[PDB]
């Protein structure tokens, strides 16, 4: 007897019992971060430990289940994700050493504090103070002490720890039949078994360079933009021929950048859009804005939401003895039981986030009709893009006025667009250098062309050509300023922001043109598109069965992401990148050093 | 559905083959799945189908119960006391009726 029936009944049985477990697990995460009680913590320690038991067992059991005698191809990806040989091929000694290393760093990470110079009593948990001073003001030595210390305590204690972790990860996923730990990470984007649209583990090396060298003429001048957008800052401590110090990252790896811009500003007299006094005068509430969003989505044809959604969803801050943090998120409990959480307070960003979660309600009701082990979108790239399409369209004055924040007597101008583009210029343009740095450094080391001891040094000719940061205190293996942040303190990768950036304008243009709209891709809105609404709702019904080119050719007709929109959709920005720099130095030389 | 966990009631999900119209199936036996024999126990390519509700008040609309009653009026030949209620009226005398 063939094993196709065996494995499909096996995956269905996993669906049943592991869906009991994962249903109570989604409800348990929900409870855990809404109730903090010791028995519930003991449930997290013990009952939550029952979660990890069964998946490994059938991961080992389905490992014995074979791949040869299967028609109905579906099971092939199932076992590759349910045999999950991966790390289990190697020795429990290796995996146990790395895991107990992770437990050690987790404990010491949970226990961490660093604080003020000369006054170790008004101490500073990295939450409320001098770090916020670094961003709201321009306090140089302040961000020094913060970031120096927040590695000097954490990073030094785990430097041999983290280094052994990384090198032995290299060893394991060299032995993984993959190339290294990061190709083990790379195992996400592989697709095959449909003719013509294969993706390999070596072709992706070159093409993204080409799209990045389709970034590079923009990028090297985008490079020449932040380089130039930092000119008016400091004449005496930064020579125009010099490398800029390390403590201008914005973060502990430069994850956000908008710091020196409002000092560099050419035109900053006009205040931003602030309507908080009007909210105080009128006193709207999230309940009113909730049906506001509901009827806006009705204007594009979207229905209401059921009872079990919100009879557990608490929409207000609890306070009292029930301590709950105010980070809003979108949740799902499964089996026709879906639930959401937010904190309520009058804010335009809170309204936009509520729209984010309702657009997500429809947009991930998209894949609620698939079998349990496959409930996703065509690939994982459309996700962070189709998530924020409508919210970013609402960032334009049109929908923000349709929600009634502004009076009708306001006339339309193109100066609004020019300074909105300018504002995005001094706000958002910071992350892509580091993003693609980690992406391309990842692909080379994952194939093996950049070492670990000269990580900083090779990342200096680079970064003097990426975003301009270099140590004034050079780092050897003792001193310490990468790991002051939790994200890359836990070793992830950086392709998703590139995917979002180039994909979102492609979706807007394709929706515009199937809806028969024309214009620039900053002005390419998807509102009032019912005839493409059953397309936009079909843009959200794909599955995970086909290679990405089939899904593209169906939803939009263009099989690939387009970077001619990168070189000619920036044609105005790439020029405003030049126009703002037409009377400024295009370049800022890179040879002087602070410590000589 | 009861609150404290409805592990009393049970579900059934599997059988071997197709079935004729109009019969009751109460099969709870081990299913032989692969080439290896089962001998009536879970093991090498073997499976026991039965599971319980375990209902908490949280389960969703599709998995919330919908009592379906199939009123199967099977038509055969009887006087069939059960046909339907009959009404009546009041009578008037000494008139052409």
In the 8-state DSSP scheme, what is residue A335? T
CA angle, corner B73, sides to B67 and B75, nearest 5? 165
The structure tokens listed for B7 are 């592990």
Q: Can you spell out the DSSP letters for A374-422?
A: G-S-SSSSSHHHHTTHHHHHHHSHHHHHHTTSS-TTPPP-SHHHHHHHH
Structure tokens at A528: 């009032």
**Cα–Cα distance measured from residue A250 to residue A143, given in angstroms and rounded to the nearest whole number:** 9
User: Which whole-number Å values give the CA distances from A73 to A79, A287, A530, B52, in the listed order?
Assistant: 11, 48, 36, 32
The secondary structure of A207-236 as a DSSP string is HHHHHHHTTHHHHHHHHHHHTGGGTTS-SS
Three-class HEC string of A77-97: HHHHHHCCCCCCCCCHHHHHH
Helix (H, G, I), strand (E, B) or coil at A592: strand
CA distance B48 to chain A (A): 10
Phi, psi dihedrals of residue A517, rounded to the nearest 5°: -110, 155
Report the residue from B14, B54, B63 with minimal CB separation from A336. B63
Task: Give the DSSP H or E segment for A23.
Answer: helix A3-32
Residues in chain A: 596
> How long is chain B?
97
Cα distance between residue B29 and residue A557, in whole Å? 52
Number of Cβ within a 10 Å radius of residue B45:
20
Question: What is the distance between the alpha carbons of residues A172 and A166, in angstroms, rounded to a whole number?
Answer: 10
Contacts of residue A3 in chain B, CB cutoff 8 Å? Answer: 34
Confirm if A596 and A472 have CB atoms less than 8 A apart.
no
Catalytic residue among A163, A487, A538, A579: A487
Q: Is A357 a catalytic residue?
A: yes
Residue A44: HSE in the Cβ half-sphere, 13 Å Cα cutoff: 14
Pure H helices in A484-524: 496-514
Residues of B in contact with A5 (CB under 8 A): 33
HSE at residue A480, side-chain half, CA atoms within 13 A, is 22
CA distance B80 to chain A (A): 45
| Cα A457 versus chain centre, distance | 27
Q: Name the CA dihedral angle for A247, A248, A251, A252, rounded to a multiple of 10 degrees.
A: -30
3-state DSSP assignment of residue A334: strand
Q: Are A230 and A588 in contact (CB under 8 A)?
A: yes
**Phi, psi at A57, each rounded to 5°:** -60, -55
> What residue spans of A537-585 are helical by DSSP H?
548-555, 564-579
- Tell me the Cα Rg of chain B: 26
Q: Is A243 exposed, middle or buried (0-12, 13-18, 19+ CB in 10 A)?
A: buried
Which residues of chain A does B35 touch, with a Cβ-Cβ cutoff of 8 Å? Answer: 1
Query: What does the alpha-carbon distance between residue A526 and residue A194 come to, in Å, rounded to a whole number?
Result: 32
Alpha helices in A204-347 (DSSP H): 204-213, 216-226, 261-264, 276-282, 286-298, 307-310
Residue in chain A closest to B46 (alpha carbons) equals A6
Residue A375: closest CA among A329, A338, A328, A327: A338
- With contact defined as beta carbons under 8 Å apart, do A351 and A64 qualify? no
A20 to chain B: which residues are within 8 Å by CB?
A: 54
Contact predicate B5/B56, CB 8 Å? yes
Distance in angstroms (rounded) separating the CA atoms of residues B56 and B58: 5
A72-102: burial string, b at 16+ Cβ within 10 Å, e else: eebbebbbeebbbebeeebeeeeeeebeebe
Cβ-based burial of A500 (10 A; exposed 0-12, middle 13-18, buried ≥19): middle
Q: Name the token pair of A353.
A: 């986030």
CB atoms < 10 A from the CB of A577, how many? 21
Virtual torsion, Cα A428, A152, A131, A392, nearest 10 deg: 20
Per the structure block, which two tokens stand in for A258? 């908008």
Please indicate whether, in this complex, the C-beta atoms of B63 and A9 are within 8 angstroms of each other. Answer: no
Residue A173 main-chain phi, psi, to 5 deg: -85, 0
Determined by cryo-EM
Q: Locate the chain A residue with the closest alpha carbon to B12.
A: A16
Contacts of A65 (CB under 8 A, 6+ apart): A3, A6, A7, A10, A79, A83
Contact A353, A377 (CB under 8 A): no
Cα(B10)–Cα(A126) distance, integer angstroms:
53
For B55, residues 6+ apart whose C-beta sits below 8 A from its C-beta are B1, B2, B5, B6, B9
- Cβ neighbours of residue A21 closer than 8 Å, sequence gap 6 or more: A50, A51, A54
Q: What is the CA radius of gyration of chain A?
A: 26
Q: Phi and psi dihedrals of A4, rounded to 5?
A: -65, -50
Contacts of B35 (CB under 8 A, 6+ apart): A1, B45
3-state DSSP assignment of residue B52: strand
Strand stretches in A285-375, DSSP E: 329-330, 340-341
Number of Cβ within a 10 Å radius of residue A372 = 15
SS3 B86: coil
CA pair distance A313, A110, nearest whole angstrom: 29
Question: Is A467 in contact with A293 (CB distance < 8 Å)?
Answer: no
Cβ atoms of A148 and A142 closer than 8 Å = no
Burial track A522-541 (b if 16+ CB lie within 10 A, e otherwise):
bebbbeebeebbebbbebbe
**Binding-site residue set of A for Zn(2+):** 356, 360, 384
Active site annotation includes A142? no
Looking at chain A from residue 279 to 308, which residues have their Cβ under 8 Å from any Cβ of chain B? Answer: 306, 308
Angle, alpha carbons A10-A11-A17 (nearest 5°):
90
Q: Rounded to whole angstroms, how far apart are CA atoms A449 and A464?
A: 19
CA dist., res. A464 & res. A474, Å (int):
14
Helix (H, G, I), strand (E, B) or coil at A244: strand
Of A400, A388, A587, which Cα lies nearest the Cα of A500?
A: A388
- CA dihedral of A237, A239, A242, A243, whole degrees rounded to 10: 30
Contact A201, A486 (CB under 8 A): no
Compute the half-sphere exposure of residue A280: CA atoms within 13 Å on the CB side of its CA.
4
List the one residue out of A73, A189, A78 whose CA is nearest residue A547: A189
* CB neighbour list of residue A504: distance below 8 Å, 6 or more residues apart: A385, A388, A389, A392
Residue B44: count of CB within 10 angstroms of its CB: 12
Q: Which residues pair with B11 in a beta bridge?
A: B51
Q: What are phi and psi of A213, to 5 degrees?
A: -80, -10
The residues, ordered by sequence, that sit 6+ positions from A69 with a Cβ below 8 Å of its Cβ are: A2, A3, A4
- Nearest Cα of chain B lies from the Cα of A335 at a distance, in angstroms, of 6
Q: Is A21 on the interface with B (CB under 8 A)?
A: no
Sorted by sequence, the CB contacts under 8 Å of residue A367 that are 6+ apart come out as: A375, A376, A377, A540, A541, A542, A543
Residue B42 bridge partners (DSSP):
none
CA distances from A558 to A163, A348, A550 (A): 44, 35, 10
Say if CB A526 and CB A508 are below 8 A apart: yes
332-361 in chain A: CB under 8 A from chain B: 333-338
Crossing angle, helix A92-110 and helix A159-175, to 10 degrees? Answer: 150
Q: Is A69 on the interface with B (CB under 8 A)?
A: no
Closest to A293 (Cα-Cα) out of A455, A402, A157: A402
**Which two three-digit tokens encode residue A538?**
């079909």
3-state secondary structure of A75: helix
Q: State whether residue B37 sits within 8 Å of chain A by CB.
A: no
Strand partners of residue A5: none
- Is there a contact between A183 and A173 (Cβ–Cβ < 8 Å)? yes
Token pair listed for A85:
């040989």
Question: Catalytic pick from A357, A388, A471, A509?
Answer: A357
For an interface test with B, give the residue of A1, A16, A65 to mutate (most B CBs within 10 A).
A1
Residue A378 neighbours by CB distance under 10 Å = 24
Instruction: Check A5 against B33: CB less than 8 A apart.
Output: yes
For residue A509, what are the CA distances in angstroms to A145, A359, A390, A400, A517? Answer: 47, 19, 13, 21, 8
User: Are B34 and A1 within 8 A, CB to CB?
Assistant: yes
Q: Tokens in use for A226?
A: 């932040």
- The residue assigned the tokens 């301009």 is A468
> Measured between CB atoms, does A398 come within 8 Å of chain B?
no
Which of A77, A80, A79, A83 minimizes the C-alpha distance to A59? Answer: A83
Distance between the two ends of chain B, CA-based, in angstroms?
60
Measured in degrees and rounded to the nearest 5, phi and psi for residue A408 equal -65, -20
A501: CB partners within 8 A, 6+ apart: A432
Three-state DSSP at A64 gives helix
Helix (H) or strand (E) segment spanning residue B10? strand B10-11
Is the Cβ of A20 closer than 8 Å to some Cβ of chain B?
A: yes
CA distance B24 to chain A (A): 24
- Non-local (6+) Cβ contacts of A506 within 8 A are A556, A558, A561, A562, A565
The nearest alpha carbon in chain B to A26 belongs to B58
Q: A380, A417, A451: which is closest to A525 by C-alpha?
A: A417
Give the largest Cα separation in chain A, rounded: 80
Interior angle at CA A388, CA A352 and CA A414, nearest 5: 80
**Which token pair is A458?**
């090779």
């Amino acid at each position: 007897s063939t094993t196709e029936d065996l494995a499909k009944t096996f995956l269905e049985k996993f669906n049943y019992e592991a869906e009991e477990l994962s249903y109570q697990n989604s409800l348990a995460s929900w409870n855990y971060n809404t109730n903090i009680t010791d028995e519930n913590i003991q449930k997290m320690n013990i009952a939550g430990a029952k979660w990890s038991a069964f998946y490994e067992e059938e991961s080992q059991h389905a490992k014995t289940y074979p791949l040869e005698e299967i028609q109905d191809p579906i099971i092939k990806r199932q076992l590759r994700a349910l045999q999950q040989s991966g790390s289990s091929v190697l020795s429990a000694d290796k995996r146990e050493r790395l895991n107990t290393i992770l437990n050690a760093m987790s404990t010491i990470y949970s226990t961490g504090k660093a604080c003020n110079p000369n006054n170790p009593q008004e101490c500073l948990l990295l939450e409320p103070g001098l770090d916020d001073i670094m961003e709201n003001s321009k306090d140089y030595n302040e961000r020094l002490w913060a970031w120096e210390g927040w590695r000097s305590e954490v990073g030094k204690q785990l430097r041999p720890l983290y280094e052994e972790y990384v090198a032995l990860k290299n060893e394991m996923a060299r032995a993984n039949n993959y190339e290294d730990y990061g190709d083990y990470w790379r195992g996400d984007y592989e697709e095959e078994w449909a003719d013509g649209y294969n993706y390999s583990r070596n072709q992706l090396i070159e093409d993204v360079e080409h799209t990045f060298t389709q970034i590079k003429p923009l990028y090297e001048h985008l490079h020449a933009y932040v380089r130039a957008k930092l000119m008016d800052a400091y004449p005496s401590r930064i020579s125009p021929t010099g490398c800029l110090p390390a403590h201008l990252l914005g973060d502990m790896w430069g994850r956000f950048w908008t710091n020196l811009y409002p000092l560099m500003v050419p035109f900053g007299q006009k205040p931003n859009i602030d309507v908080t006094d009007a909210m105080v005068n009128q006193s709207w509430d999230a309940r009113r804005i909730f049906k506001e969003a509901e009827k806006f989505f009705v204007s594009v044809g979207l229905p209401n939401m059921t009872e079990g959604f919100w009879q557990n969803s608490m929409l207000t801050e609890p306070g009292d003895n029930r301590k709950v943090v105010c980070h809003p998120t979108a949740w799902d409990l499964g089996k026709h039981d879906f639930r959401i959480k937010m904190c309520t307070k009058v804010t335009m960003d809170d309204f936009l986030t509520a729209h984010h979660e309702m657009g997500h309600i429809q947009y991930d009701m998209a894949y609620a009709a698939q079998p349990f082990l496959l409930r996703n979108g065509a690939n994982e790239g459309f996700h962070e893009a189709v998530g924020e399409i409508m919210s970013l369209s609402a960032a334009t004055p049109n929908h923000l006025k349709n929600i009634g924040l502004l009076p009708p007597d306001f006339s339309e101008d193109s100066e609004t667009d020019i300074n909105f583009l300018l504002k995005q210029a001094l706000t958002i343009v910071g992350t892509l250098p580091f993003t693609y740095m980690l992406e391309k450094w990842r692909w080379m080391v994952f194939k093996g062309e950049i070492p670990k001891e000269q990580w900083m040094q090779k990342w200096w000719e680079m970064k003097r050509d990426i975003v301009g940061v270099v140590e004034p205190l050079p780092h050897d293996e003792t001193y310490c300023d990468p790991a002051a942040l939790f994200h890359v303190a836990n070793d992830y990768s950086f392709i998703r922001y590139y995917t979002r950036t180039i994909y979102q304008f492609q979706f807007q243009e394709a929706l515009c043109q199937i809806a028969k709209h024309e214009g620039p891709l900053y002005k390419c809105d998807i509102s009032n598109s019912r005839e493409a609404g059953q397309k936009l709702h079909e843009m959200l019904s794909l599955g995970r069965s086909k290679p990405w080119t089939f899904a593209l050719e169906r939803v939009v007709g263009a099989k690939t992401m387009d970077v001619r929109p990168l070189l000619n959709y920036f044609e105005p920005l790439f020029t405003w990148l030049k126009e703002q720099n037409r009377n400024s130095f295009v370049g800022w030389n890179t040879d002087w050093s602070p410590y000589a | 559905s009861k609150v404290g966990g409805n592990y009393n009631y049970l579900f059934r999900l599997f059988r071997k083959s197709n079935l004729k119209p109009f019969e009751r199936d109460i099969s709870t036996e081990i299913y032989q799945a692969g080439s290896t024999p089962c001998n009536g126990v879970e093991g090498f390519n073997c499976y026991f189908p039965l599971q319980s509700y375990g209902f908490q008040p949280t389960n969703g609309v599709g998995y919330q119960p919908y009592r379906v009653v199939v009123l199967s009026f099977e038509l055969l030949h009887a006087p069939a006391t059960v046909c339907g209620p009959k009404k009546s009226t009041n009578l008037v005398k000494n008139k052409c009726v």
